[PDB]
Amino acid sequence: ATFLGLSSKQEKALVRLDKYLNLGEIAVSLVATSIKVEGRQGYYQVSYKQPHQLYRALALLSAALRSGQDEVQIEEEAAYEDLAYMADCSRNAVLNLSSAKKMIEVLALMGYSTFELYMEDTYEIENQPYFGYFRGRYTVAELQEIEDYAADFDMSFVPCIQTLAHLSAFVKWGIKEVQELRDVEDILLIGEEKVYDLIEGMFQTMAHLHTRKINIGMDEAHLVGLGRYLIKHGFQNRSLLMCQHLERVLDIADKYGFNCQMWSDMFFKLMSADGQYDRDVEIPEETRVYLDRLKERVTLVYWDYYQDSEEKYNRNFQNHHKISQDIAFAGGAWKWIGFTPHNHFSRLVAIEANKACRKNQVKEVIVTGWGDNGGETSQFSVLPALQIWAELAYRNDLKKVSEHFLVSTGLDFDDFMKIDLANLLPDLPDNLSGINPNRYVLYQDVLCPLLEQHIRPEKDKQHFASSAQQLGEISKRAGEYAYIFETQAQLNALLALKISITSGIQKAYRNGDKEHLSALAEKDFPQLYQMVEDFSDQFSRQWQQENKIFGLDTIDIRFGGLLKRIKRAQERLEQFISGQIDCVEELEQEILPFNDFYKDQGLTATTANQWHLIATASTIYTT
Amino acid sequence: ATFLGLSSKQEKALVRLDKYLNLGEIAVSLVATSIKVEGRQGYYQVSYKQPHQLYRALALLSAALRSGQDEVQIEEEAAYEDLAYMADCSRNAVLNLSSAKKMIEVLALMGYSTFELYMEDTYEIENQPYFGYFRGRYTVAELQEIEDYAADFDMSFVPCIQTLAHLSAFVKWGIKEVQELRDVEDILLIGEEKVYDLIEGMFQTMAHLHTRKINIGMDEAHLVGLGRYLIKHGFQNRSLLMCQHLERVLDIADKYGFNCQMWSDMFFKLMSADGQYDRDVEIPEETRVYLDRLKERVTLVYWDYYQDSEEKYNRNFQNHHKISQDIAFAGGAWKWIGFTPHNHFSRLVAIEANKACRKNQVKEVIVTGWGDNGGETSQFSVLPALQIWAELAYRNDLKKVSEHFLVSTGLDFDDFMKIDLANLLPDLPDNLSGINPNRYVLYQDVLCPLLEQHIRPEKDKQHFASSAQQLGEISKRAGEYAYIFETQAQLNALLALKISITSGIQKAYRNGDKEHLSALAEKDFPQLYQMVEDFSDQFSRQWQQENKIFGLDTIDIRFGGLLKRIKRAQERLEQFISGQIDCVEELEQEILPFNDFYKDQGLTATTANQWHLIATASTIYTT
């Protein structure tokens, strides 16, 4: 392709995106609306409102031509001034520089204005050697390189940090200078000057960036004011306490020229009678005066990944607008439920959230790709969800999602959606969130299978086996992303065999069938152990491709423990079969429902997303 | 031997104890002081104040004879009306019936009046299926059998339970009927009728026993009143809240005929300005009035395992005397610091505690054998400590500790004390508690060794190697306890190699010596891996001899994780050596002190006793 009207900067960006765009022998001229592309017979005119929108416009041109269109007539008016993707870099997976750059390229093509990294403790602060210690924290140079790459595409960069809670990986260090910063649990001590010193250190680090927009956190500080704070000061008004801390942090941000966003949940939890987020709260006048003074100094971010109807989001927006007009929305790219994402669920809720955002004058949507409890899901697992949100933002529909996605990823959208398969059990109601058999079927014990009442052995096993087959074929046409489909093919195959053995043991033991137990012990057990080893190897390839090495160690621990537990199950069965023991006491125990979260929806599967609770009923982190 | 004046019950006990006593062809006749033994020329008279003291008296006689005495003339007056041993059955290791019986025999010979088991959730309660689920909870029949065996020696049985906090293994269950019982963290909800229903269930279970003496717990409920309690009730006077709960619990106990003890720490924590135990107390007038009525109905147990001077204990007794004259003391049999006990430290503090308990006219001493953070230490690891407290109680000195211990165990006291060796680093000040390299040298990572600054790579390694040799010889002469010494011999040998390799890789990586890194990778790593496998096998034999199978699973997880991390370290080094990677980022990180707990003492070693924090700097239990 040849171009008129490009700047040298845009030339540079197009060189980097050529491998996606492959525009062929056409002439493009760059000259009201977010995006317009029009032309035919080898001549196309593109226009854009914000500079970064050039890259979605050119993706759209590419996708149209690739689909076989000669005449192209595209006009989009985006609903949101800003559309961001936030990757979790705090749940053990720290995105490596190469993968950050790739993600930025794809986001540029999709139409995102902004890239964000969620970093609790995973950046460096002067004279805080324990902050991010052995975590793969980003150096200032690494953050600058990521920011600068985004800026090459006229994209913004917004760090998402923590200035109150969600600092467990820092406050664990038994060092006087760290411990003195603590209130309780994962929460920093409000009113402690060494805490404001720390927070100023965070801003000093981020002030080395160009960006002056930041998310300061402040979600989920449930026991704020009730720890060392209570010992020092007695019981205080916790709503005002939050306001006080927030004003202190905004004052620090102001010193360095930053404008701030924060997660909004604590205002609602502190003012509602049952301490919940989804609540219309009455605000005491003294708190009102305080919030009224802070509403123009911070953007509140309403986060919600769960509702299946527009009206449910609308209610929360109305709750928020009683506090402030400046409300941003965070929607979900579901990749925090184990090893397997849920792009399908992401789509379902995004459609409805987008309706509510448009009704409530939202100017910014932040798509959050959390990594809860170890960061076991691929960083690129959620490309479909990210395209979905871009389509919703730009077109208000998903009519062109496949066409556009092919340019973004080089593979078919429906194929890519099959990455979800280890969560897509047959018969599951589609509107229930967090149902994650991919993870709990993997990590549950063999002898003491705590999730067994939530498994339909034949139906689920057949689904996993079918899924492995499907993904084995998809990985052969998945281009640069084949590795993530290989991981999923292996996981599904492993889950099928793991169910067969685990459920087979329960049945055979109850029947006293030592012949069948022997069959399992001597043939199926070696196979399962090898499949786990092979899965570990593939997962480690995936992780190293995407992430810094730090944090893989927790997954080694989890896999190594699973392997040792498979060996124990073999040994215990062999001792029973041989007559060395008269019973296997583990197998004499009645298995109970693991939880009742979805009892009243009546399905068999559930949500279970804490490894240490899946893997054992014994103590393991407590004293 | 031939016995005169025994009841049928006593005759049976003598038959059972012959294997210890070896009295031979003598006559013993059962006729002012706790114990008297008097005779010569094959005829001896014994007398006791309390029936169980018969068995210590016969031990004294046995020891005297084995020492070559013909004429024997021994009198003892015990300082304490009751002397108890409490084994932990809540830290994953649930003592099995055979081991309970053995322990009771030994305790009878030493002079203990009482056997106790500490059971948070590890017993059965009607209609509470999650209470002790997959934990190896005791059935009523099992507790009755254990109590009855104690009773055969005229020893009492006292269950030690929890009626407030330390219930993490129960409250983790995501079941509405469990979650509704919670305040915060590991604490039950005071004032909730369903909690009193649960507590009444506890008493219904224990009422099947003969004993009507019970320790109801109530230690370490630090955030009591601050969770769901606070949302429901506002901020209340927490010392009064404790009294209110206690009164409900005592009313329940009364209904079933029980007399109660409780740990005393929360009264001090809630009525000190620092919130600590070892503090003077400001007792509000209203709490005084409540305490004054409750003090007549409960025995407060002052627990302290740490002080090196009588005066420090005395100060605490004085403060306790502000609340009540009925104060029992809990001393320590140090077995909660990993895989290896500390009988030596136990001795040091017991000498001083015994002085304070005598000065303060204490009637009951309970020696506690906690098992913190997984129950990894043998249940029989602390027999020396138990003899020491018995000698202190009966004779106020340790002049006959060895002679009497030989009766109790069949083996030499100083040999048995060597079981401590993995904690007895050269140069350690003897008065510092909790220093536990046995555990943290084992579980620390190889690539990312978080405890490395606390390890002296030649000095400690030599000590572990020397200890392995010493223990290998002791195990050959240790009879029925050889297995616990074999575990220790293996552990010490493993720690020596593990240090050699971990420090060796830091050095060879630093000096760029790929040849030596390859030698380590190819020769030493497979050796270390095999040693860990073998140690796991030996530990598992030890565990199964002593405990129910439930809880071993956590240790399989921990060892499996370590094995996998050893494998990872080999693989990462191999990739570096072979040129597949240009650096090993793990080994480029500066290693910091792990904690500063003993920094003020200028110490290299430290205390580190939570597996999840030793093993990785990553997140592993948090979301």
Ligand SMILES: CC1=N[C@@H]2[C@@H](O)[C@H](O)[C@@H](CO)O[C@@H]2S1
């Ligand atoms: C703000 C937010 N705080 C929590 C995060 O720490 C989790 O990762 C996320 C997904 O479970 O849920 C909420 S969103």
Ligand SMILES: CC1=N[C@@H]2[C@@H](O)[C@H](O)[C@@H](CO)O[C@@H]2S1
């Ligand atoms: C009462 C007591 N409660 C605690 C126990 O849970 C621990 O096991 C023990 C040893 O660390 O220390 C105190 S004593």
